[PDB]
Amino acid sequence: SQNPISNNNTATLCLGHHAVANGTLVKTISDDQIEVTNATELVQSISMGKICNNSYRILDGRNCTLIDAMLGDPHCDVFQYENWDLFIERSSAFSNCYPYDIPDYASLRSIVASSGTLEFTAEGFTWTGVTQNGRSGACKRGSADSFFSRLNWLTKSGNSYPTLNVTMPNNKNFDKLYIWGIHHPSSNQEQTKLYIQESGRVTVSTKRSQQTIIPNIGSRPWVRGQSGRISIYWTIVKPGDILMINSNGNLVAPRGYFKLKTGKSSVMRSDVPIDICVSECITPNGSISNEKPFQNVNKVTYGKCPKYIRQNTLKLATGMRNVPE
Amino acid sequence: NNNTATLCLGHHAVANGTLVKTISDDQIEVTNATELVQISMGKICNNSYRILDGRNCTLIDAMLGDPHCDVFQYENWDLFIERSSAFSNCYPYDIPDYASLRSIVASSGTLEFTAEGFTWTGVTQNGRSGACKRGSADSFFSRLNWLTKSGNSYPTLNVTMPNNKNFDKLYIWGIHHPSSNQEQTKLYIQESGRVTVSTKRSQQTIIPNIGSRPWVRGQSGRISIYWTIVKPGDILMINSNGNLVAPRGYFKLKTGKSSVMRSDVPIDICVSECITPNGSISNEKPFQNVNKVTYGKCPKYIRQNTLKLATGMRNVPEK
Amino acid sequence: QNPISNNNTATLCLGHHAVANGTLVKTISDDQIEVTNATELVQSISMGKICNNSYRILDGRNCTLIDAMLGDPHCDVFQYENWDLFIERSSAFSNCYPYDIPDYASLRSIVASSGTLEFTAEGFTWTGVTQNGRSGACKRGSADSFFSRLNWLTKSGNSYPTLNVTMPNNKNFDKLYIWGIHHPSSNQEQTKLYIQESGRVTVSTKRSQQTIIPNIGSRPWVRGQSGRISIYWTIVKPGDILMINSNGNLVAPRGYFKLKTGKSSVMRSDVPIDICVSECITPNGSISNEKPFQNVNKVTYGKCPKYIRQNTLKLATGMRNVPEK
Amino acid sequence: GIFGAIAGFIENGWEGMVDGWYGFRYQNSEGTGQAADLKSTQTAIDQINEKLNRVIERTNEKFHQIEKEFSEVEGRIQDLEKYVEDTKIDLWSYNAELLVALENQHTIDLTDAEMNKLFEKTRRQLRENAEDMGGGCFKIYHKCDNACIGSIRNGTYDHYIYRDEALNNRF
Amino acid sequence: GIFGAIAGFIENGWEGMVDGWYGFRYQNSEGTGQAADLKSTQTAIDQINEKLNRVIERTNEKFHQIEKEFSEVEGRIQDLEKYVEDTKIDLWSYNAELLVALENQHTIDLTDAEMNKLFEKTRRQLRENAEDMGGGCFKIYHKCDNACIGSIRNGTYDHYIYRDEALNNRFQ
Amino acid sequence: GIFGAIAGFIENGWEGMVDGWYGFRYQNSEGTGQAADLKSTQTAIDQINEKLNRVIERTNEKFHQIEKEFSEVEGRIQDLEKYVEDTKIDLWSYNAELLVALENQHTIDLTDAEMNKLFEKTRRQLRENAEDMGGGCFKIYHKCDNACIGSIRNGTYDHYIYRDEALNNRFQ
Ligand SMILES: *[C@@H]1O[C@H](CO)[C@@H](O[C@@H]2O[C@H](CO)[C@@H](O[C@@H]3O[C@H](CO[C@H]4O[C@H](CO)[C@@H](O)[C@H](O)[C@@H]4O)[C@@H](O)[C@H](O[C@H]4O[C@H](CO)[C@@H](O)[C@H](O)[C@@H]4O)[C@@H]3O)[C@H](O)[C@H]2NC(C)=O)[C@H](O)[C@H]1NC(C)=O
Ligand SMILES: *[C@@H]1O[C@H](CO)[C@@H](O[C@@H]2O[C@H](CO)[C@@H](O[C@@H]3O[C@H](CO[C@H]4O[C@H](CO)[C@@H](O)[C@H](O)[C@@H]4O)[C@@H](O)[C@H](O[C@H]4O[C@H](CO)[C@@H](O)[C@H](O)[C@@H]4O)[C@@H]3O)[C@H](O)[C@H]2NC(C)=O)[C@H](O)[C@H]1NC(C)=O
Ligand SMILES: *[C@@H]1O[C@H](CO)[C@@H](O[C@@H]2O[C@H](CO)[C@@H](O[C@@H]3O[C@H](CO[C@H]4O[C@H](CO)[C@@H](O)[C@H](O)[C@@H]4O)[C@@H](O)[C@H](O[C@H]4O[C@H](CO)[C@@H](O)[C@H](O)[C@@H]4O)[C@@H]3O)[C@H](O)[C@H]2NC(C)=O)[C@H](O)[C@H]1NC(C)=O
Ligand SMILES: *[C@@H]1O[C@H](CO[C@H]2O[C@@H](C)[C@@H](O)[C@@H](O)[C@@H]2O)[C@@H](O[C@@H]2O[C@H](CO)[C@@H](O[C@@H]3O[C@H](CO)[C@@H](O)[C@H](O)[C@@H]3O)[C@H](O)[C@H]2NC(C)=O)[C@H](O)[C@H]1NC(C)=O
Ligand SMILES: CC(=O)N[C@@H]1[C@@H](O)[C@H](O[C@@H]2O[C@H](CO)[C@H](O)[C@H](O[C@]3(C(=O)O)C[C@H](O)[C@@H](NC(C)=O)[C@H]([C@H](O)[C@H](O)CO)O3)[C@H]2O)[C@@H](CO)O[C@H]1O
Ligand SMILES: CC(=O)N[C@@H]1[C@@H](O)[C@H](O[C@@H]2O[C@H](CO)[C@H](O)[C@H](O[C@]3(C(=O)O)C[C@H](O)[C@@H](NC(C)=O)[C@H]([C@H](O)[C@H](O)CO)O3)[C@H]2O)[C@@H](CO)O[C@H]1O
Ligand SMILES: *[C@@H]1O[C@H](CO)[C@@H](O[C@@H]2O[C@H](CO)[C@@H](O[C@@H]3O[C@H](CO)[C@@H](O)[C@H](O)[C@@H]3O)[C@H](O)[C@H]2NC(C)=O)[C@H](O)[C@H]1NC(C)=O
Ligand SMILES: *[C@@H]1O[C@H](CO[C@H]2O[C@@H](C)[C@@H](O)[C@@H](O)[C@@H]2O)[C@@H](O[C@@H]2O[C@H](CO)[C@@H](O)[C@H](O)[C@H]2NC(C)=O)[C@H](O)[C@H]1NC(C)=O
Ligand SMILES: *[C@@H]1O[C@H](CO)[C@@H](O[C@@H]2O[C@H](CO)[C@@H](O)[C@H](O)[C@H]2NC(C)=O)[C@H](O)[C@H]1NC(C)=O
Ligand SMILES: *[C@@H]1O[C@H](CO)[C@@H](O[C@@H]2O[C@H](CO)[C@@H](O)[C@H](O)[C@H]2NC(C)=O)[C@H](O)[C@H]1NC(C)=O
Ligand SMILES: *[C@@H]1O[C@H](CO[C@H]2O[C@@H](C)[C@@H](O)[C@@H](O)[C@@H]2O)[C@@H](O)[C@H](O)[C@H]1NC(C)=O
Ligand SMILES: *[C@@H]1O[C@H](CO)[C@@H](O)[C@H](O)[C@H]1NC(C)=O
Ligand SMILES: *[C@@H]1O[C@H](CO)[C@@H](O)[C@H](O)[C@H]1NC(C)=O
Numbered sequence A: 001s002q003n004p005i006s007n008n009n010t011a012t013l014c015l016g017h018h019a020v021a022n023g024t025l026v027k028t029i030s031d032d033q034i035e036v037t038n039a040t041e042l043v044q045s046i047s048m049g050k051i052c053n054n055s056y057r058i059l060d061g062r063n064c065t066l067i068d069a070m071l072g073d074p075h076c077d078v079f080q081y082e083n084w085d086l087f088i089e090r091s092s093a094f095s096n097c098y099p100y101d102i103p104d105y106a107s108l109r110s111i112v113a114s115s116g117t118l119e120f121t122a123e124g125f126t127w128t129g130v131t132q133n134g135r136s137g138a139c140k141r142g143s144a145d146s147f148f149s150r151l152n153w154l155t156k157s158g159n160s161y162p163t164l165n166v167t168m169p170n171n172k173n174f175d176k177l178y179i180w181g182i183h184h185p186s187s188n189q190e191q192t193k194l195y196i197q198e199s200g201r202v203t204v205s206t207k208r209s210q211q212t213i214i215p216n217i218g219s220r221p222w223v224r225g226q227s228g229r230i231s232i233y234w235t236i237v238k239p240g241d242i243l244m245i246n247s248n249g250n251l252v253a254p255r256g257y258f259k260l261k262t263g264k265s266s267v268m269r270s271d272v273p274i275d276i277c278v279s280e281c282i283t284p285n286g287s288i289s290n291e292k293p294f295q296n297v298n299k300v301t302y303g304k305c306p307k308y309i310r311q312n313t314l315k316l317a318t319g320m321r322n323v324p325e
Numbered sequence B: 001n002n003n004t005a006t007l008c009l010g011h012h013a014v015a016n017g018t019l020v021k022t023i024s025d026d027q028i029e030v031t032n033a034t035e036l037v038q039i040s041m042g043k044i045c046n047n048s049y050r051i052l053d054g055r056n057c058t059l060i061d062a063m064l065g066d067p068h069c070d071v072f073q074y075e076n077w078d079l080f081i082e083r084s085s086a087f088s089n090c091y092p093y094d095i096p097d098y099a100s101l102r103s104i105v106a107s108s109g110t111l112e113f114t115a116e117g118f119t120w121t122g123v124t125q126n127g128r129s130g131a132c133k134r135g136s137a138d139s140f141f142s143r144l145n146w147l148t149k150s151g152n153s154y155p156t157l158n159v160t161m162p163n164n165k166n167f168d169k170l171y172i173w174g175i176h177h178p179s180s181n182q183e184q185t186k187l188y189i190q191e192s193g194r195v196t197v198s199t200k201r202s203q204q205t206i207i208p209n210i211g212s213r214p215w216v217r218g219q220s221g222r223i224s225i226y227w228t229i230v231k232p233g234d235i236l237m238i239n240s241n242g243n244l245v246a247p248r249g250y251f252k253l254k255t256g257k258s259s260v261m262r263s264d265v266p267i268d269i270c271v272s273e274c275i276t277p278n279g280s281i282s283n284e285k286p287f288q289n290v291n292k293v294t295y296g297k298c299p300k301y302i303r304q305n306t307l308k309l310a311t312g313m314r315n316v317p318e319k
Numbered sequence C: 001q002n003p004i005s006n007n008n009t010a011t012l013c014l015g016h017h018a019v020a021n022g023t024l025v026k027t028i029s030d031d032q033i034e035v036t037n038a039t040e041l042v043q044s045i046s047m048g049k050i051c052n053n054s055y056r057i058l059d060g061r062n063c064t065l066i067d068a069m070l071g072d073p074h075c076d077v078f079q080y081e082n083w084d085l086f087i088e089r090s091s092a093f094s095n096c097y098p099y100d101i102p103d104y105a106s107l108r109s110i111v112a113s114s115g116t117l118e119f120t121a122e123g124f125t126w127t128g129v130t131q132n133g134r135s136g137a138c139k140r141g142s143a144d145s146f147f148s149r150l151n152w153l154t155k156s157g158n159s160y161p162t163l164n165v166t167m168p169n170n171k172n173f174d175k176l177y178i179w180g181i182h183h184p185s186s187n188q189e190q191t192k193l194y195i196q197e198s199g200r201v202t203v204s205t206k207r208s209q210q211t212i213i214p215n216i217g218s219r220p221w222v223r224g225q226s227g228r229i230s231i232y233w234t235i236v237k238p239g240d241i242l243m244i245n246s247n248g249n250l251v252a253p254r255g256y257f258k259l260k261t262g263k264s265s266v267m268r269s270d271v272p273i274d275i276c277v278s279e280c281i282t283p284n285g286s287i288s289n290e291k292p293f294q295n296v297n298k299v300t301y302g303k304c305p306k307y308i309r310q311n312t313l314k315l316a317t318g319m320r321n322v323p324e325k
Numbered sequence D: 001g002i003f004g005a006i007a008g009f010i011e012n013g014w015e016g017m018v019d020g021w022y023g024f025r026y027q028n029s030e031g032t033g034q035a036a037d038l039k040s041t042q043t044a045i046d047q048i049n050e051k052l053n054r055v056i057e058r059t060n061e062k063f064h065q066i067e068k069e070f071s072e073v074e075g076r077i078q079d080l081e082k083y084v085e086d087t088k089i090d091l092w093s094y095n096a097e098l099l100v101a102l103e104n105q106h107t108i109d110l111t112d113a114e115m116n117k118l119f120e121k122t123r124r125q126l127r128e129n130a131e132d133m134g135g136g137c138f139k140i141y142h143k144c145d146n147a148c149i150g151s152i153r154n155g156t157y158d159h160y161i162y163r164d165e166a167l168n169n170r171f
Numbered sequence E, F: 001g002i003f004g005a006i007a008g009f010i011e012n013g014w015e016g017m018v019d020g021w022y023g024f025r026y027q028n029s030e031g032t033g034q035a036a037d038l039k040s041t042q043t044a045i046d047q048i049n050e051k052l053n054r055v056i057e058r059t060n061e062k063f064h065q066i067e068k069e070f071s072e073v074e075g076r077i078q079d080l081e082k083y084v085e086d087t088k089i090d091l092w093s094y095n096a097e098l099l100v101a102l103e104n105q106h107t108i109d110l111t112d113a114e115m116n117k118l119f120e121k122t123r124r125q126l127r128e129n130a131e132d133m134g135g136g137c138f139k140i141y142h143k144c145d146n147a148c149i150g151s152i153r154n155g156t157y158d159h160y161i162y163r164d165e166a167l168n169n170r171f172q
C-alpha cells in the first residue's frame, strides 16, 4: 500500500477455515499420510477382559463340557434342566465317568448348543427280560457306584438275554432327540458273562432312518479302572414318526428325550471369568464394545458384534485437512 | 430497455421427484431414478429351460423305479422340480449319502437306463412285495432285482460285467435287511448274508442286519441302496451268498449342467431365463430379493428389498 | 486488430503435455477413454517351468505322495525326504499290493502340509505270529515284497493269538502311525492265514478309538490279487498312548512319522522343473508376482497375485490424452 | 453439489424447459425467449446411461450349486453350508449398498459439474462485455438481439465487435 | 485439495476461529472483527456426521457359527473350515481398507469445496466493488462499517449503492 | 473432466512438452518460448505413482489350501468345495473391476484439477493487468520481457508496479 494506518474509506475482508494445534494422520486415495483436524478409530482393539451376563443369558460350564452335562455325569448333575444363550467351556474340564467316545462329537455338540437347552423328559420304556440300572466304579455319584443319569445300562437277568423290542411313537409337534449307546468289553469272558451272547447288536430305527452298531471286544487303555469303552449315538425322531430299539446285547438304553428347538443359542471356548456388566458382543477374550464397525480381538464371536479384520487400526477422518499457522 | 440484455442459465426439473441415497446425503431428491432389486411371476416358465415336474415323486424314486414314478422312465431335464407333497410308495428304504446321490443324478440330468444280461445261477429272480403294488398286485422296484433261494439252495453268486464303452456307468444295487432270523434262513438259506461289489479301483462290502423295524406298508424289513461307478476299460464284479438286491443294468452318467429344485408353484408356458422356488423372475435388474435358491441367468440375491439408482440430476422445483 | 503484437502487450498460455500414441482405459464415466499412459494389472502369462531356488520343490515323478510314504518298491528313493511343495505327475502309478484308503484325500493333505517323510522305527513285539509277509504283486528288486513301512502279520503254526501291544509318546511332538487291515478273497483264505473266522482290529488312544472289521469276497485281479487292504492312521499327541488289539487280519506298523505345523503342500502338474527366480508357482510353471492380479490358474502356492476371471485390467498412469491437429 | 451450481448460486430449476437438461433463458430488445444446450446435455446422458455395465457384468448363467434350505438337522456339515451362503449374501449385500451410493454420488457431481462448466463457457465468451448478476444470470451491456444471442449459444460470439459499446455503459 | 482452496490459495487455517469451520476475518473503519459462517459449516458437518451408516448398517446380530479353532488335525473337512474363514476375513479386510480410503478422500473433497463455494458466493455479491487480492482476501474499495459487513454475511449486500464510490477508487 | 480444463476450455495438449506434465507458452518482444511447471507435475505424479499400494496389501504368502480340481464325482463334500472357490473368485473379480474403474476415474479428475488449479493460480497473480482470452490463454496488457515472464512462473509477480500501465492500455 503501504500506509501504516489503513484508510477509512476502504476495507479488507478475508476468508478462511479453522484449525487445531495437534492434528492426526489419515490415509486417502491420493496421499499416503495427510494431517486432519480430528479422526476416529474404527477397529476395536481393546477387549473388556470379562464376559457380560446382563445382556444375553450366559451359562458357565465350569469343569463340565456341554456333552458331559447332557450325558449326565455325576459331577454335572447341577446342570439338569438348564437353558442358555451362550454356553461356556473351560480348558480344565474333564470326564470322571465311564470312558467314552462319540463318533462325530462336533455335530452333536453343535445341535445341542444351537437348540440352547437341556430340557429332559423321562419316558416309560418297557424292558422285558433284562436287569436295569447298571453301575460302575469308574462313575461315582455320592457314596455308591453309578452311571450317566440320562442313560440306562442294560444287563442280563438270570441266564438269558432275549431279543429286546420296544415302541415309542412321537405324538408331539416338535423334534425329539434320543441319546443312546453301546458297550465295548475288554475280553470275550466279559461279553459272554454280561450279556450271554458272543456278539451283541443295537438296531435303532425309525420309519426312514436306521442305525446298527456291532461291538468290538478288545483291550483299550486303562482309564479309571476300565479297559473297555462305551460309544454314544443319537437319533432325532420327528413329529408323527416312531422310535424302535432292537437289541440282543450290549445296549445302553435311553431313558428319555430332549426337546429340540430352532434356537438362537451357541457354545464358546473361553477361560476369562464372567462378571456383572452390560455388553451385547462376546468373544473368547471377553465382551467388547459394539460401537465401532470393525474389531481385531477375535474371529470367534457371538451376538451383536462388529466384523473381524486383519487390520489393527483404521482412522476415519471426521474433519478437514489441518494447516497450522 | 434496449441498451442492455439479460441472459440467464439454468437446468430442468420435475414436479414429482424421487428420493435416492448417496455418500454425502441420506435422502436427496433427483429428477429420475430406477429400481435395481427385483416380485416373481408366480410360475416356473418352461420355454427357455427344460423343466420336469415330479408331481408326487422324488428324483430317487423315479430313478429306482417306484410304481407311481414309472412315467419318468427315460427322462432328461435341465431342472427337476420336486414337490413337497412327494412320497415313496414301494418297499421302505434308506440310502447312506442320500443327498450325495441326489446331486450326482440331478447334475447328470438324465435317467437313461440300459438293461444288461446278468446271469444269476441257482436263485429265484424278480422278488415281489405287497408294499410295492404295480397294478393292484405285488411287485418291486423296476430297476432293481430281488434275488432269493431256488429249491433249498442259495449258492455263492459270482458275476462279472466289463465296461467296453467310452463313458462312466452308474450301477444302483442294494441289500435286503430282514426282520427276523426265520426270514434269513427261509429266503436266503444261510444264517448271515454278505455282498461284495467291487472294481479294479474300489470296493464296497455290506453285511445285513437282522432286526425289527417300524411297520411301513405291511413290512418291517428294510432295503439299503448303494451305488457304484464303472469307468471306461474298468470292470464290475458282484460276489454274494445272501441278501443281494441285484441291479438289472446301468444309468449313463455325463457331465451335464442340470440340477434339482424344491418348489410348490404351477408350471406353464412363459418367457423368462431365471428360475426360483417362488417362480420365474425377470433378470433385467442386477439384484433380487425373492429367494437365494436360483437357477439360470439370475440376479444376485441380497438382503435389501430396494436400491434406487439415480438416472438424472438433483431436483430443485420452482417456488 | 493490429497484426503486430505491441511492445506494451504479451501473451501467456497454459497447457498440458500430450502423446501421439495413446492408450485406452475404463473409468466410471467412460467405457473407453484415451490416456497419456497405462499399465497392466493382470499377469496372464506363465514362465512355462517351475523354479526351485526359493521354495524347495520335490518332483514326485512316477510316485504319488502316498505311494512314497507307504514304501512302494519303486519309490524307495523318496525316503527321509522333506519339501515345501511336492509335485505329483499324472503319469504316476502304484506298483505294490492293491489298496484303498477311507478318506484318501484327508491323509494326503495331512502329510503334504506336514512337509516331511521323516520315519523312525519302533520295537513292536508281535509274540506268537509270523512277520514280514509279502506278495507277488509287490516286487522289490526281483523278488516278492511289501510296503517297507507296513508289516504283514500272519499265523504261526495253527493259531493267531490275540495281539496286544502298547507304545507311549514320551517325545515332544505328534506321532503319525500308518496302519491297516487286510481283506481276503474268501472264507477259505480267511482261516488259512488268520485261523479265526471273524477278523478284528482295534486301535485306541485314551480318548479315541477306531475299530475295523474285515471284508470278504472275490474282487478283480490287480497284479494277480483278488485280496485288498485298507489303510488307516492314528495321531498320538504328547502324553497320550497307543494300543493295538487284534485277533486277525492286521497289517501292523513298523514305526511312526514325524508331524509338523509346517507351510508345505502338494500340487498336481506335468510341467518341468528348472533353475529360475520366482516366489509364486502354479500348475503351469512359475509366475511373476509383480502385478496385483493374475489369470493363469486358481491353484497357487507362495507369494502369489489373486486369481480373477478377467484376463486384462488397464490402470491409468497418466492424464487424459488429447493429440494436436 | 460440490461445484455449488445446482441448488447453489442458480436458485432453482425450470419446469417449463422440456427439450434439454441444461439451457438458456433471456430477455432483450425483441422480448423474451428460451433455448436448450444439446452439447452439455448429451455429455450428462452419455455418462449416466447404463453406467453399471462398466462395473457389474452381464448376468451370467449359474447351474447346480449347493443346498441352502434343510428339513433335517445334521450338525457340522450343514452349519458350514449355511455359513458359506450367509457369508456370500452379506458380502454381496454390502457391495450392492456401496456401489449404488458411489454411483449416485458420482451422478450428482457430474451433473453439478456440467452446469458449472456451461456457466464458465459463457463467461469466457462474453469476456468483459457482461457481468455476473448472481443466480447464474449475465447482464449484457450492449444491444443484443436474438441473432446475437444465437451466436453466444453455438459459440461464435465475438466480443471485440461490442467492446466499445459495453465498456462505455459499464463504467 | 482438488479445488485448491484448502492448503492452496488459502495459505493456512485459523486456530483462533472456534465457533465454526469457515468464517470471515475483516478490518474496517470501526475496527477488526471475526464471524463464523453457520451455513457452510453445517453443510460440511451434516455430510461427515456418521458417513459409515450410509453403507454399513450399525452391526449385525449373529449366533451359532462354525468352529474357527481346532485341537486335532483331521484333514479335508477341517481344511475347508479354515479356508472359508480366511477368505471371509481377507474379503472384509479389503472392504474396510478400501472404504476408509474413499470416505477419507471424499471428506477432504467436500470440505475443500465448501471453502471454495463460500469464496465464489462472496465474490458474486461484491461484483466490481472489490478485487481478489490473493490469500483468500478481498480489498473493498469503499467505506464499509460493521453493518455493511453483516449485509455481505447475511447475503443482503447491495453493490449498486457503493458502485460509484467503489469504481472511482479502483482506477486512479 | 468435471473441471472442464483438459479437453474443455483448453483445446488440446502439447506433444512438444517432454520435460514436464504442465507448463507455459508465451510471446513478447523477445520472441516466443515454452517452459514446464515442476510443482503441478510433481503433485500429480505423487498421487498416481504406486496408488494401488494405498488399498491393496503387500502380496503375502499362501501355503496349503483346499483342493480345487477333482477327477471323480463325490457329491455334497465336492459341491461345497467348488462352490466356495466360485463364490470367492467372483467377489475378487468384482473388487478388481470396481477398484480399477474408481482409480482410473480418480486419475482423470486429479489431473484435470491440477490443470485448472495452475490456471486459477496465475489469474490471481495477474489481478487486473490481464484478461482471459479463452482457450486457457491470458492477454497481459503491459511490457513483459523474459525476466517478467519468469517471475510469474516461479510466483513472484508484483502486479502493483505494472497496474497503472495496464489499466490505461485496457480501457484507453
Ligand atoms: C493288554 O496289554 C496292556 C499293556 O500290557 C494291558 O494294559 C495294562 O493292564 C494292567 C493290568 O490291568 C494295568 O496295570 C495297572 O496300572 C495302574 C496304573 O495306574 C497309575 O498308577 C501307578 C501307581 O500306582 C502309576 O505309576 C501309573 O503311571 C498310573 O498313573 C496301576 O494303578 C495298577 O496297579 C495296582 O493298583 C492298585 C493300588 O491300590 C492295586 O491294588 C492293584 O493290584 C493294581 O494292580 C495296575 O497294575 C496297566 O495300567 C495297563 N496299561 C495300559 C496302558 O492300559 C492290558 O491289560 C492287556 N489286556 C489283556 C486282555 O491282556
Ligand atoms: C416289535 O414291536 C413292534 C411294535 O409293537 C411290532 O410291530 C407291530 O407289529 C404288529 C403285528 O404285526 C403290527 O400290527 C399292525 O398294525 C397296523 C396299524 O397301522 C394302522 O393304524 C392306523 C390307525 O392309527 C391306520 O390309520 C392305518 O391305516 C393302519 O391300519 C394295522 O394296519 C394292522 O392291521 C392288521 O392287524 C390285525 C390284528 O388284529 C389283523 O387281524 C388284520 O389283518 C389287520 O389288517 C396290524 O394290526 C404293527 O403295525 C407293528 N407296529 C410297528 C410300530 O411296527 C413288531 O411285531 C415287534 N417285533 C417282533 C419281532 O416281535
Ligand atoms: C468270480 O469271478 C471272477 C471273474 O470271472 C473270478 O476271477 C477270475 O479268476 C480266474 C481264475 O483264477 C482268473 O483267470 C486268470 O486270469 C489271468 C489274467 O491274465 C490274463 O488272462 C486273460 C485270459 O483271458 C487275458 O485275456 C488277459 O491278458 C489277462 O491279463 C491269467 O494270467 C490266468 O491265465 C492262466 O490260468 C492258468 C491257471 O488257471 C495258468 O496255469 C495258465 O498258465 C494261464 O496263465 C488265469 O486264466 C481271472 O483273471 C480272474 N478275473 C478277475 C477279473 O478277477 C473269480 O475267480 C470268481 N470267484 C469265484 C469264487 O468263483
Ligand atoms: C518494440 O520492440 C522492438 C524489439 O524489442 C526490443 O525493444 C527494445 C526497446 C528493448 O526492450 C529490447 O530488449 C527488445 O528486444 C524494438 O526494436 C529495437 O529497436 C531499438 C532501436 O532501434 C534497438 O536498440 C538499439 O538500436 C541500435 C541498432 O543500430 C543500437 O544502437 C543498439 O545496439 C540497439 O540494437 C533494438 O536492437 C531493436 N530490437 C530489435 C529486435 O530489432 C522496437 O524499436 C520497439 N518499438 C518501438 C515503437 O519502440
Ligand atoms: C488285582 C485283581 O486281580 N483284582 C481283581 C478285580 O479286578 C476283579 O474285579 C473286577 O474286574 C473286572 C475285570 O476287568 C472289572 O474291572 C470290574 O470292574 C467293574 C467296575 O468297577 O466298573 C465292576 C462293575 O460291577 C462292572 N459293571 C457292571 C455293570 O457289571 C464293570 C464291568 O465288569 C466292566 O465294565 C466290563 O468291561 O467292572 C471289577 O469289579 C475281581 C473280581 O473277581 O477280582 C480281583 O482279583
Ligand atoms: C405274524 C403272522 O403270523 N403273520 C401272518 C403271515 O402268514 C402273513 O404275513 C407274512 O409275514 C412275513 C414275515 O416273514 C412277511 O412279512 C410276508 O410279507 C410278504 C410281502 O411282502 O407281502 C410276502 C412276500 O412273498 C415276501 N417276498 C419275498 C420275496 O420273500 C415278503 C418278504 O418275505 C419280506 O418283505 C421280507 O422282509 O413278505 C407276510 O405275508 C400274513 C399274510 O398271509 O398273514 C398273517 O396272519
Ligand atoms: C508409461 O508407462 C509405461 C508402462 O506402464 C512405462 O514403461 C516402462 O518404462 C520403464 C523405463 O522408464 C521400463 O523399465 C524397465 O523395467 C523392466 C521391468 O522392471 C526392467 O526389466 C528393465 O530393466 C527396465 O528397468 C519398462 O520396460 C516399462 N514398463 C513395463 C511394465 O514394461 C513408461 O516409462 C511410462 N512413460 C511415461 C512417460 O509415463
Ligand atoms: C442483514 O444484516 C443487516 C445489518 O447487519 C447486521 O449484521 C448482524 C450480524 C448484526 O451484527 C446486526 O447488528 C447488523 O446490523 C440488516 O440490515 C439493517 O437492518 C437494520 C435493522 O435495524 C436497519 O436499521 C438497517 O437500516 C439495515 N441496513 C443495512 C444497510 O443493512 C438486514 O436486515 C439483515 N438481513 C437479514 C435478512 O437478516
Ligand atoms: C475428536 O474425535 C474423538 C473420537 O475420534 C471424540 O472423542 C470421543 O468421543 C466419543 C463420543 O462422544 C467418546 O466415546 C469418547 O469420549 C471419545 N473417544 C476417543 C477415542 O477419543 C471427540 O469428538 C474429539 N476429541 C477431541 C479431543 O477433539
Ligand atoms: C494351466 O493348467 C491347466 C491344467 O491344470 C490347463 O487346463 C487345461 O487347459 C487345456 C487347454 O486350454 C484344456 O484342453 C484342458 O481341458 C484343461 N484342463 C485339463 C484338466 O486338462 C490350462 O489350460 C493351463 N493354461 C495354459 C496352458 O495356458
Ligand atoms: C523468480 O524469477 C525472477 C526473475 O525471473 C527469472 O526466472 C528464472 C527463469 C531465471 O533463471 C531468470 O532467467 C529469470 O529472469 C528472479 O529474479 C527470482 O530470483 C526468482 N525467484 C525464485 C524464488 O525462484
Ligand atoms: C499439543 O501437544 C503438545 C506436545 O508437547 C502438548 O504440549 C500440548 O498439550 C498440545 N498443544 C495444544 C495447543 O493443544
Ligand atoms: C484371545 O483368545 C485366544 C483364544 O481364543 C488366545 O489365543 C489369545 O491369546 C487371546 N488374545 C488376547 C488375550 O489378546
Ligand SMILES: *[C@@H]1O[C@H](CO)[C@@H](O)[C@H](O)[C@H]1NC(C)=O
Pocket (backbone or CB within 6 Å): C052, C053, C273, C274, C275
Ligand atoms: C533344482 O532343479 C535343478 C534342475 O532340475 C536340479 O538340478 C537341482 O537338484 C534342484 N535343486 C536345487 C537345490 O538346485
Ligand SMILES: *[C@@H]1O[C@H](CO)[C@@H](O)[C@H](O)[C@H]1NC(C)=O
Pocket (backbone or CB within 6 Å): D147, D148, D149, D150, D151, D152, D154, D155, D156
Ligand atoms: C451460429 O449462430 C449464429 C447466430 O446467428 C449464426 O450466425 C451462425 O449461422 C451459426 N454459426 C455456426 C458455425 O453454426
